[PDB]
């Protein structure tokens with residue numbers, strides 16, 4: 001079995017490990033992936049947080065707080081910042097090579113960041129159904145990646161990610177009426193072809 | 197007002213409303229604490245910690261148990277689910 | 280003019296409730312407003328606007344006597360025509 005890879009393709013989309021694109025425009029802070037799931041120790045708690053990102057635009061700068069080995073290293077506005085260094089510094093590593101920030105954290109964890117929006121965490125064979133979050137459980141089964149925090153499969157992803165917000169009193173996002181044309185391309189069929 | 201104006205300066209005061217015979221208004225179930233955390237552990241919440249290192253804020257909140265659920269304090273045993 | 284529900288998070292302004300009291304945070308823009316049950320406006324505001332923000336809550340300087348500088352710019356003794 002190979003090494004899986006989340007992603008954040010654009011402002012509001014998410015590609016799970018097993019492979020499931022879905023739409024979730026949010027504006028609160030959300031658990032992208034973690035290990036403290038049900039009956040496990042809880043080593044790492046990668047999070048993600050967006051501001052002004054329900055409608056994609058030149059707005060929507062992302063913020064990412066990754067919590068491994070009792071640490072707090074986080075990143076936004078181009079650079080990476082350490083708010084609390086972690087104990088076993090041996091595994092830590094930062095490779096600012098090219099357009100990316102490759103960032104190792106252990107034997108079986110890695111993070112990639114294009115300095116703008118993308119978040120591609122890479123995990124190894126070690127876990128195999130030990131994680132959960134917006135990226136799912138990493139089990140091979142591709143249609144159980146919508147198991148919410150309350151331990152049930154949902155069908156509508158906009159109710160899924162609302163289960164994974166950290167602040168349980170911020171605003172949960174709104175069920176958008178489904179359509180093939182977003183706001184600007186709504187009733188602008190000219191522009192909708194120049195984009196296609 | 198005088199309570200908060202000293203709190204903002206870096207020196208908070210405690211229990212002054214015990215004998216003052218005036219408590220600020222709040223809805224049912226809650227009354228005015230002093231220096232409660234903003235990250236109120238509510239019912240439909242994720243048990244994550246040490247992200248809410250924010251400063252301490254005054255305002256009314258629930259009793260020791262009696263978790264929050266939709267603007268009212270309710271006992272932790274009766275936490276609902278959502279779907 | 281359209282009445283919205285609450286909470287609400289558009290345009291980088293999280294309109295929440297904290298401790299049973301309503302809040303309007305604008306940390307991207309540098310302010311935190313709130314109201315209590317009785318009605319008591321409050322405005323916490325950053326040091327980025329030092330000797331700046333002139334208004335009904337005065338400028339954010341150290342002094343406390345000069346902070347009636349009208350919309351023209353005039354130190355007035357009266358706290359009312361200001």
Ligand SMILES: *[C@@H]1O[C@H](CO)[C@@H](O)[C@H](O)[C@H]1NC(C)=O
Nearest residue numbers: 329330331338339340341342
């Ligand atoms: C405020 O602005 C004035 C004019 O720019 C300046 O002279 C002063 O040093 C600033 N700060 C104080 C201490 O008033």
Ligand SMILES: [Ca+2]
Nearest residue numbers: 139141144145
């Ligand atoms: Ca799965």
Ligand SMILES: [Ca+2]
Nearest residue numbers: 338342343346
């Ligand atoms: Ca002043």
